[PDB]
Write a protein that binds this ligand. Structure first.
Ligand SMILES: [Zn+2]
Lengths: 409, 649, 484, 426
């Protein structure tokens, strides 16, 4: 990364970076033939012979003499797995480099294989009363065999429904967001109060707000520093696309220093794709607790009850909090751009927005918002075209606006 | 559930009634459910192997499933006596036999291979039946033939054991890549049979593709191999075009209809609806006439031979016998019109059944017995592969090298168990080779077997006590040259970690294999392998310019099924996210230009072909018009006929 | 040799598969299963079924010149002839019809149209399944449904009883079972039919007053209408199912009633008809017609398959009595234990023929201005010899041979599909629970061989399972709950 | 902008040549030239040489009595509830019969038929008008007197219409899609009006219900031809208009490859031969010098079995091209950033039987694929301007993270190479 900075983000440095990456891969290939990486359990057996600690660790079962709770067995299996990894790394073995590098070894599966398996949930999501005292290497119980088969069938069913999901939301989110454009202009000249305020609770929001500017004590828009800590617990105003005063598009001030990077590509399209990918992946993995915030994010984007009950600053702060809960990390600029598309106001002109008081700032459902869009070309390409063409509810006869897909028709 | 509390290990102890599929896979006691499911699916997906062998580590149930399954052989239901034999063609014949006790007659037949479905099939080892002659008594347990899956003594074989080692090769075994030597790939030979039919009407005529003027054969004969991946072709005759197109009959014209396949002709079946006089005056139908005469002669002979049986009411026959005889009697009689697919045809229709062997194609799949799937990435000369060159086993070579990225993530330590068992067996084989006297070598052999499996050791000791001295020596020779089999129960009686621990403790002579030039002393062992069906050839659609639909747009066709196209050639369609991502670049005009040039606009695609054909091959400078696309015009028709209209801006 | 030893050691094994289970498909005979498909036509008295038989294939061709035609699409079929009888105006007609069925080949295969199809086992329920609030019985004609509802009634002093009634909702109408028995045998025949006659008494309001308080301390009273009132023993009313009977009886406590109406069967015939159709004239006729239809509900096959005592299944009335006498226990039943389930292979094949014959018999149900002779002649005309195979290949009861290798006993011979015709499987969440595995599967069904295409749609039986004989292929001959 | 809705007047639109007359679609085992299956105006199904295009529009006269348009009818039902009853003429006993004998008069507005309703349309609208709810609809009616009644009815191309004349086993069955079915009824129905030349009241007593069924069938037509032709993903508006079929395309299964930089990829010989068929045909025409037909013969022989000379020709082609003969690789289904790649051909595989597409390992993560059996699609690119425009889709562009502006992790070293470099360093 730092190289790309001293050399001006040129194309030639990108080419040479690709070349060096490829060559390094080839060199790793030849060194990897000419150095062996084989695996067998004889290494484990010999280690156990050498170290009695590992020997008795692999030779262990749950003390079933007392009643064991779910949390207790989870704690004990966690401590045992950590002990296994620690002793494996400490001593020389034919898999030392494997676990030090971390490629091709998963802690959980390792602990399950050597240490005890641990309890498994029912198809409906209930822990069984009788956890698997044995371990995969040691053997299994017929009841344990049944439990494992049930878990596998649960995984298969979940995979079936997950594939059946078909990735439907990206369809409409992209279909709406794709028309967004960028305009090379120094500053939208928006009002100071048009800058939306955000409060800081942790460093995560600072990560969300890189390559941007905040008004200082003097009010000058100075670059935000994520490493900086003086911004903890402060409400400060930031420029945003949802409040930009450019009617042609988005000025370079709102996009911050990031603007220069993105001038080649449709900013909104990157925003929508870079949002829809990790979120869908996280939701699908969670379905394979943490899933509930993801559904909350989906509702916030879709159902729009919270938007009908609150204001733009509140909704964007909630969106940032939800993004933090979900675990994915994306630049807040793209989120503010989705909100800019989300926007809806009475006067299509943004010049009024540059004044002291902003006009009505209402936001609707994603499908409603797209169907709201006065350009009919994108509306027809959507669903629900029946009422659009045969009924006058959506005044599609009235609506008219230019767009990119309008050329496609 | 309480039912979960209900089930007790004591109820099922010392019995395998619960487990159904993993009866064929050793050591299910250590594997995960997902892997077991994968293995069950693979065993549903296994394919025939030309060099099939029985696995070294067996679970006593392969023989059972083989014996009970009845799609791979034909056991005579009772002792019979053959009365006569007839042959249809060179490679197939039929046997008329009579029951010894019941006094009822029955048919048998032979063929080089059996057609299972589409591509899939298998070649038939008809040695036993062909060894039979006339007037010889057959026995109840005698099997007339069998597939290659069955060994000499009905031993089940659905895979083959290969030397394998865990090793990463040039960052090329990343993901599930598998590299194999040439000899092993030559082993994994699999048959394939295709059935294809061609219709010849009064209009279309054949061509003398094969042979000189005197030997007019549009399709290869039985012994011949199909050449140039083409069986036959037909020219669409026209009365007007009889002066230019029909000329040069020996050479094919550009606008004709060929057929495409590979292999060797196994059998031919012709149905003709035309009088034979025309065939007599047809020179370009001499081959079909000859085949028809051969078939008719066969039917005449069979009818003559079986008439005495069929007209005898006292005789008892199978319904199969009567059905076959009625079929031939249908064939011989005149005025017998054939109506394929509930419709009469003109000319004739002839069907070829063809068999061919394939070796391993780069990109096929091989899996063990625990779902360790993979794809054959690249194949090498065996000299360019890790080998051990030390000690007694100097010069040993490993055919395949699996991916050592991680087995712990795939949750199946059983593969390692099998590998180390077979490696230890190799070492024991060396030790018993070093032995001089028969008594002490059989002693050490049964000693090891007892260390691993005591009851099967008792069975071996009973057998060796049963065997005579010279036969016993021949047996040890077989052990030293093949190996030693190991019995391994699926769930009850298999090995665990502790027995391996004890083995390595006592077997201090065991040592890592020191491969040459390789830094680590890797380990080589036998593992069972089975080849799947999913081949790269199954998805290979590629189209340049094929038939368009009524909307003047690309559309798939039925030529591929009728074997008129070498490759599948079915076009790809661009969908939602395709247009979306293409519009990630700020070149909407460019995307529209591409869509118009490829398929949408007829004029634009035509001008693309015009410009592209001529001009500099290295540099293509396309020029595009602005004619309205067909899609826009048909949408205009949609709107105007709806009562809607069109009005830009 | 190594092969010699391997063969011997495989022979010495003690664990063997079930041989008769493997060749089970050869055991089934179509004639026996076809017989009830003919018998269900006996709803209309006009048809007189004589019997069906498989025609021999013993015919042998002789040279002839009938410009005959032969086709490549090879199908191996045997002919079956059914003989029915009709008699009108002292003249009789024996109608004889013929159909084609595929024959067993290789001891398990069908050859149709030069293609190889294989039948497989199908999994279904034994009977009396539990869903929603309603108890049900699965029968080929029409599943019997009984649905319960809460009711609160106040006694003479106001004693309120929260208390649950089971109405019968059949023939697209909610018609209680007690009124069926109650039209059949009268109130007193109804009460004595369950043996509960003596415990129950009934009197008018003044006669209710003359009833001593000792009777009240022995029998709880259930006021019928502003005048009339019934009484049931308190010890009898202790049983919950007895509460249920009294509850449906309370549902019979219609507001409008007169003593002579309580004392006439024709009155309840009219009530039943009015439930079916409010037309006063049709009340008697439709009541009787639905009485005989409700008798038609029972079929000999269902009586055979059901594990209940024959006295409880002598007639359909006895069947309903058995259901509602034990209603609460039958509500509590496993929906997944295989002892509740069963396997069928030769039944669904004739199901399209059953539907066609039911359609014909339904046309005979709605006969009007049609002579019975001509009606039967028209009905026994639509059936075609090739109709059976045509329906089979249409509805995909058989599956196209998708094999790839010779192994067949473990993916052809023992392949069962839980779904299929006459099956409730779909994408529902409870059907998702259907995809879930159940502990009773252990040792009778392959628990880890589901198709990855759709989980739980199909699997493989274990070869060590032995099904009890003379149980119509029941995994357990006894029901899930014996009702001890 | 785009294609704008307007129920423009058909009379100035309509043309005399496209007005169809009443005739059965078939005639003496041949399509009638006057019915809907006319070849005079309307195209030829089997032959594509018809100079006139598929977008010809057929046309039906109803000038005698003007009819409300179906498209606005639903809107009409909004402005005036149950206008279907007003146009429904039950006030008749000569042929309709007494029937119910009890009906909702509703001020005698109902059961007046279409003609009377048209005559008093303004009065009925004044009777049923909500200034608070239906005011906008009534205003849009105000801007539209000219379009409410339609005098011409159009019909789709028979070539566009999938309706066919099959030969069913029972007999020749005209298997039409349902569209013309109602259309046939429509024209058959209009036949009666042009049949009803004689004037008499009882005829009008029957003629008005005929107009009722006219409007009913018109609404049937609009709803039906919008049910499937332009609805859902089966519909035409999404199946083709946005994305369609491609004639120069292929698809293959990917396998790893080494010894080359990340960008270079290799293709199997057969698929490369098929994709660039016309480039090779051009070069072979130039070098052989004979006409293009024998060149096509040679190329056929070349794809049939392995040839050294043809391989040399493609090697020259890859060497000497301006852009290196690049293409697009996309992974079904593309749901991630840069899920499409712009790659450049580097080497033609020599082994004939090989059919897999080599790809460098480092591109596995960016396109989200695996060697397990995924099927990926390739679209060749030809125009030089297209090459320049799609250069932004080259993996070198995706090397920079559009998210954070750092080096992209998807192009970072994968598992095995990470391990190996770790051995070298540590
Ligand atoms: Zn701005």
């Amino acid at each position: 990364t730092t190289l790309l900075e001293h050399f001006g983000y040129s194309n030639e440095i990108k080419s040479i970076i690709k070349d060096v990456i490829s060559e390094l891969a080839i060199f790793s290939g030849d060194i990897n033939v000419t150095f062996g990486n084989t695996v067998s359990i004889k290494s484990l057996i010999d280690l156990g012979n050498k170290v009695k600690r590992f020997r008795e660790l692999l030779h262990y079962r749950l003390p079933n003499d007392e009643a064991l709770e779910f949390n207790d067995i989870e704690a004990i299996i966690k401590k045992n797995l950590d002990e296994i990894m620690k002793i494996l790394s400490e001593t020389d073995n034919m898999l030392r480099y494997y676990i030090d590098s971390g490629a091709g070894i998963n802690s959980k599966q390792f602990g399950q294989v050597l240490s005890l398996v641990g309890s498994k949930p029912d198809l409906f999501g209930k822990i069984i009363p009788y956890p698997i005292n044995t371990s995969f290497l040691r053997g299994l119980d017929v009841r344990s065999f049944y439990i494992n088969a049930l878990g596998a069938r649960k995984a298969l069913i979940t995979n079936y429904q997950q594939v059946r999901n078909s990735g439907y939301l990206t369809r409409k989110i992209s279909m709406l967001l794709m028309d967004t454009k960028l305009i090379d202009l120094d500053d939208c000249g928006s009002h100071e109060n048009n800058y939306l305020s955000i409060n800081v609770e942790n460093k995560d929001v600072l990560k969300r707000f890189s390559k941007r500017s905040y008004l200082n004590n003097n009010g000058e828009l100075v670059e935000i520093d994520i490493n900086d800590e003086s911004l903890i617990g402060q409400v400060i105003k930031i420029p945003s696309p949802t409040t930009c005063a450019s009617n042609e598009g988005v000025c370079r001030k709102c996009y911050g220093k990031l603007f220069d990077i993105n001038k080649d590509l449709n900013i909104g399209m990157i925003a929508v794709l870079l949002l829809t990918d990790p979120l869908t992946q996280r939701l699908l993995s969670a379905k394979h607790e943490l899933s509930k915030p993801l559904r909350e994010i989906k509702d916030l984007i879709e159902t729009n009850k919270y938007i009908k009950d609150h204001n733009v600053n509140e909704v964007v702060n909630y969106f940032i909090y939800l993004l933090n809960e979900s675990g994915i990390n994306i630049q807040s600029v793209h989120s503010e751009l989705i909100i800019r598309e989300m926007m809806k106001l009475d006067d299509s002109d943004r010049t009024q927005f540059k004044n002291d008081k902003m006009p009505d700032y209402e936001i609707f459902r994603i499908t409603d918002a797209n169907l709201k869009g006065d350009s009919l070309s994108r509306s027809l390409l959507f669903e629900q075209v029946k009422k659009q063409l045969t009924t006058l509810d959506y005044d599609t006869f009235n609506k008219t606006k230019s767009s990119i897909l309008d050329k496609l028709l | 559930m309480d039912d979960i509390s209900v089930i007790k290990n004591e109820d099922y102890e010392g019995s395998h009634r619960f487990l159904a599929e993993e009866l064929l896979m050793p050591n299910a006691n250590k594997t995960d459910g997902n892997r077991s499911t994968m293995f069950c699916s693979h065993l549903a997906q296994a394919v025939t192997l030309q060099k099939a062998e029985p696995p070294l580590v067996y679970t006593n149930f392969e023989n059972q499933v083989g014996k009970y399954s009845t799609a791979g052989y034909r056991k005579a239901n009772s002792n019979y006596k053959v009365i006569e034999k007839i042959y249809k063609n060179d490679y197939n014949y039929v046997l008329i036999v009579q029951d010894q006790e019941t006094g009822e007659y029955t048919l048998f037949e032979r063929a080089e291979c059996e057609f299972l479905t589409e591509h899939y099939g298998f070649q038939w080892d008809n040695d036993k039946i062909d060894s039979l002659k006339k007037d010889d008594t057959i026995e109840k347990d005698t099997v007339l033939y069998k597939n290659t899956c069955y060994d000499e003594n009905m031993n089940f074989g659905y895979g083959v054991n290969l030397n394998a080692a865990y090793f990463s090769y040039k960052n090329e075994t990343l993901e599930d890549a598998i590299v194999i030597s040439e000899s092993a790939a030559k082993k994994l030979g699999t048959f394939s049979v295709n059935k294809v039919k061609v219709s010849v009407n009064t209009n279309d005529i054949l061509l003398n593709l094969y042979g000189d003027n005197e030997n007019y054969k549009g399709f290869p004969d039985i012994g011949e191999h199909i050449k140039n991946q083409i069986i036959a072709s037909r020219r669409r005759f026209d009365y007007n075009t009889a002066l230019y197109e029909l000329k040069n009959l020996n050479e094919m014209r550009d606008s004709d209809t060929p057929f495409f396949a590979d292999g060797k002709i196994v059998d031919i079946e012709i149905f003709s609806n035309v009088p034979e006089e025309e065939l007599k005056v047809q020179k370009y139908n001499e081959q079909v006439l000859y085949y028809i005469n051969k078939q008719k002669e066969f039917s005449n002979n069979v009818y003559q031979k079986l008439k005495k049986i069929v007209e005898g009411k006292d005789n008892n026959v199978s319904d199969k016998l009567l059905h076959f005889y009625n079929n031939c009697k249908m064939r011989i009689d005149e005025n017998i019109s054939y109506t394929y697919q509930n419709s009469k045809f003109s000319g004739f229709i002839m069907e070829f059944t063809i068999l061919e062997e394939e070796p391993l194609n780069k990109g096929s799949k091989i899996t063990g017995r625990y779902g360790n799937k993979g794809v054959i990435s690249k194949i090498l000369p065996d000299d360019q592969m890790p080998t051990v060159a030390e000690g007694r086993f100097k010069g040993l070579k490993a055919d395949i090298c699996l991916n050592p990225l991680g087995v712990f993530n795939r949750l199946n330590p059983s593969q390692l168990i099998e590998q180390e068992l077979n490696w230890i067996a190799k070492f024991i084989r060396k030790d018993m080779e070093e032995a001089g006297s028969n008594e002490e070598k059989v002693s050490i052999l049964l000693d090891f077997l007892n260390r691993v499996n005591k009851e099967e050791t008792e069975l071996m000791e009973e057998f060796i006590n049963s065997l005579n001295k010279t036969e016993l020596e021949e047996f040890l020779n077989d052990i030293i040259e093949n190996g030693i089999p190991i019995c391994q129960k699926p769930f009850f009686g298999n090995i665990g970690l502790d027995e391996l621990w004890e083995l390595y403790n006592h077997y201090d002579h065991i040592d890592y294999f020191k491969c040459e030039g390789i830094s680590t002393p890797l380990i080589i062992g036998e593992i069972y392998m089975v080849r799947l069906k999913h081949e790269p050839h199954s998805k290979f659609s590629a189209r340049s310019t094929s038939f368009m639909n009524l909307r003047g747009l690309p559309a798939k066709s039925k030529n591929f099924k009728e074997h008129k196209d070498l490759y599948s050639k079915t076009p790809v369609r661009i969908g939602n996210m395709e247009i979306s991502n293409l519009s990630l670049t700020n070149e909407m005009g460019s995307i529209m230009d591409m869509l118009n040039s490829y398929s949408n606009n007829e004029t634009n695609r035509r001008e693309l072909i015009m410009q592209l054909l001529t001009g500099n091959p290295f540099d293509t400078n396309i020029d595009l018009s602005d004619v309205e696309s067909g899609t826009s015009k048909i949408l205009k028709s949609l709107f105007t006929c709806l009562g809607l209209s069109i009005d830009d801006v | 040799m190594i092969s010699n030893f391997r063969k011997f050691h495989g022979n010495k094994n003690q664990e063997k598969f079930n041989e008769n289970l493997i060749l089970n498909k050869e055991n089934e005979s179509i004639l026996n299963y076809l017989d009830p498909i003919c018998k269900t036509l006996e709803i209309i008295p006009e048809i007189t079924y004589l019997g069906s038989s498989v025609e021999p294939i013993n015919k042998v061709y002789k040279f002839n010149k009938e410009e005959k035609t032969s086709d490549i699409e090879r199908s191996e079929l045997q002919l079956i002839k059914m003989s029915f009888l009709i008699e009108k105006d002292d003249k009789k007609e024996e109608i004889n019809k013929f159909i084609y069925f595929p024959k067993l080949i290789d001891s398990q295969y069908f050859i149709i149209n030069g293609n190889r199809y294989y039948p497989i086992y199908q999994l279904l329920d034994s009977g009396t399944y539990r869903t929603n609030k309603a108890l049900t019985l699965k029968t080929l004609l029409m599943p019997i449904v009984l649905r319960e509802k809460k009711e609160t009634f106040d006694d003479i002093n106001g004693e309120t009883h929260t208390m649950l009634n089971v109405d019968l909702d059949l023939f697209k109408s909610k018609v209680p079972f007690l009124i069926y028995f109650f039209s059949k045998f009268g109130f007193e025949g109804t009460l004595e039919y369950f043996g509960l006659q003596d415990l129950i008494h009934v009197l008018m309001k003044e006669d209710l007053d003359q009833l001593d308080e000792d009777e009240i301390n022995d029998n709880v009273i259930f006021m019928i209408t502003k005048n009339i009132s019934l009484v049931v023993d308190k010890n009898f009313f202790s049983n919950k199912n007895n509460q249920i009977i009294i509850a449906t009886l309370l549902n019979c406590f219609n507001t409008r009633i007169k003593i002579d109406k309580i004392y006439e069967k024709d009155y309840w015939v009219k009530k039943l008809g009015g439930y079916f159709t409010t037309n006063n004239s049709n009340k008697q006729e439709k009541g009787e017609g639905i009485i005989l239809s409700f008798e038609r509900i029972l079929d000999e096959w269902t009586k055979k398959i059901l594990r209940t005592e024959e006295k409880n299944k002598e007639d359909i009335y006895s069947v309903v009595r058995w259901m509602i006498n034990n209603y609460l226990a039958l509500v509590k039943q496993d929906n997944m234990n295989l002892a509740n389930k069963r396997i069928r292979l030769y039944e669904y094949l004739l199901h399209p023929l059953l539907i066609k014959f039911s359609k014909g018999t339904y046309r005979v149900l709605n006969n009007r201005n049609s002579n019975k002779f001509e009606k039967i002649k028209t009905i026994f005309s639509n059936i075609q010899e090739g109709f059976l195979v045509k329906k089979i290949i249409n509805n995909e009861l058989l599956r196209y041979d998708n094999s790839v290798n010779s192994i067949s006993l473990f993916t052809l011979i023992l392949r069962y599909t839980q779904s299929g015709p006459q099956s409730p499987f779909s994408s529902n969440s409870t059907n998702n629970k259907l995809r879930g595995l159940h502990p009773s599967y252990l040792g009778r069904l392959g628990l880890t061989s589901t198709s990855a295409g759709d989980p739980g749609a199909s699997g493989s039986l274990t070869p060590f399972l032995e099904l009890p004989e003379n149980s119509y292929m029941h995994f357990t001959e006894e029901p899930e709950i014996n009702l001890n | 902008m785009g294609k704008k809705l307007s129920l423009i007047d058909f009379n100035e639109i309509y043309n005399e040549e496209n007005l169809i007359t009443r005739a059965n679609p078939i005639e003496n085992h041949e399509f009638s030239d006057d019915g809907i299956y006319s070849e005079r105006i309307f195209g030829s199904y089997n032959e594509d040489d018809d100079d006139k295009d598929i977008d010809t529009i057929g046309w039906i006269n109803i000038e005698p009595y003007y009819i409300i348009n179906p498209i606005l009818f639903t809107i009409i039902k909004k402005c005036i509830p149950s206008i279907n009853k007003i146009i429904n003429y039950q006030q008749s006993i000569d042929q309709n019969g007494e029937n119910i004998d009890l009906t909702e008069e509703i001020g005698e507005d109902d059961y007046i038929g279409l003609v009377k309703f048209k005559d008093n349309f303004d009065d009925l609208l004044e009777k049923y008008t909500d200034k608070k709810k239906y005011q906008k609809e009534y205003d849009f009616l105000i801007e539209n007197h000219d379009k409410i009644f339609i005098n011409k009815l159009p019909v789709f191309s028979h070539k566009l219409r999938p309706a066919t004349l099959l030969t069913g086993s029972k007999g020749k069955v005209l298997a039409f899609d349902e569209i013309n079915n109602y259309y046939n009824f429509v024209i058959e129905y209009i036949n009666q009006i042009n049949e009803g030349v004689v004037s008499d009241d009882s005829i009008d007593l029957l003629l008005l219900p005929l107009l009722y069924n006219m409007q009913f069938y018109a609404n049937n037509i609009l709803t039906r031809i919008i049910s499937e032709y332009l609805r859902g993903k089966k519909g035409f508006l999404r199946k083709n208009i946005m994305g369609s079929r491609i004639n120069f395309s292929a698809r293959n299964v990917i396998t790893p490859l080494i010894g080359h930089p990340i960008d270079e990829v290799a293709m199997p010989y057969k698929t490369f031969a098929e994709l660039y068929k016309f480039q090779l045909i051009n070069l072979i025409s130039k070098v052989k010098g004979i006409n293009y037909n024998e060149a096509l013969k040679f190329w056929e022989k070349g794809i049939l079995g392995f040839n050294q000379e043809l391989y040399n020709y493609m090697e020259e082609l890859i060497t000497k091209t301006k852009g290196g003969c690049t293409f697009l690789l996309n992974r079904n289904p593309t749901i991630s950033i840069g899920s499409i790649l712009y790659l450049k051909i580097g080497l033609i595989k020599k082994d004939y039987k090989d059919l897999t597409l080599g790809i460098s390992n480092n591109l596995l993560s960016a396109l989200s694929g695996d060697y397990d059996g995924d099927v990926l699609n390739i679209i060749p690119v030809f125009d030089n301007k297209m090459k320049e425009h799609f250069s932004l889709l080259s993996p070198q562009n995706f090397l920079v993270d559009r998210n954070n502006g750092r080096f992209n992790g998807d192009f970072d070293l994968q598992k095995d190479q990470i391990l190996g470099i770790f051995i070298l360093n540590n």
